[PDB]
Amino acid sequence: ATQSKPTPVKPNYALKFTLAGHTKAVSSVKFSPNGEWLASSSADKLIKIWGAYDGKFEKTISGHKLGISDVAWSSDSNLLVSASDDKTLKIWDVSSGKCLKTLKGHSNYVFCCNFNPQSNLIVSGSFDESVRIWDVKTGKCLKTLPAHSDPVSAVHFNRDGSLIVSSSYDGLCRIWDTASGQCLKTLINPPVSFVKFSPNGKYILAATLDNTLKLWDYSKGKCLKTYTGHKNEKYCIFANFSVTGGKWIVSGSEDNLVYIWNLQTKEIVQKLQGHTDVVISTACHPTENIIASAALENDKTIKLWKSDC
């Protein structure tokens, strides 16, 4: 029996660092576009910045009055925006930790946020069922979209900023024209807990609270791939496209594991064990094979995992 070793690459993510410091559940982790930093947000009302490579604690950014559900980086890695239960977003100068602007308008928890590629705009989603588009320079609300009939779980700009995708507990995904705020398409029903555009421009990845992730061709309105095997019935867990090595889909799970699927085959190619509560958030480093994962109250840590491929 000669026997070789199968050819299709699989990842070998291994735990490298555990990042401790938040005093309540972590909500979101995101790598800076320049690869240097990881930002985390927490129910503890804080943002923390850490070294992306070595997990070294860098600083805490405070100012929100209640917990934070999401953070996002500007394209030039200079600014962060956070979404809080205090009904505001804040825009932060990362280097100084200064709050540059407070974005007021939502009438309930702000749950999700993102800059556009140009980083002249921010999009937000709220428990008030609306999506708002904000000018970064002035901090003023440019448009309010009557986007959904239940809390908005996610908002994301496409790669040229001309579209926004939103998801909601109402069971819908909608695509919006940025320039006009008009709805271009409705995809439709379990609650949709997460959505984002693919890096290749053509798809959206959407999570539903029936333990399912789906890759949609948004133009054609068709589901091209389904990813299962994890547990997601309760929380709005982030999912990601990993593209620095093999082409994976990465998500947290309510069984305390990080799941990694082959994007094309839909097979689970790794499960990362370590966390002691629900893995609410994962992020993939922009240039290296590094995943950051974060967990809820029983754990409160972030973990950095690295792969050869």
Place this chain on the structure above:
Amino acid sequence: XXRAX
């Protein structure tokens, strides 16, 4: 957290 329960 709202996301954390």
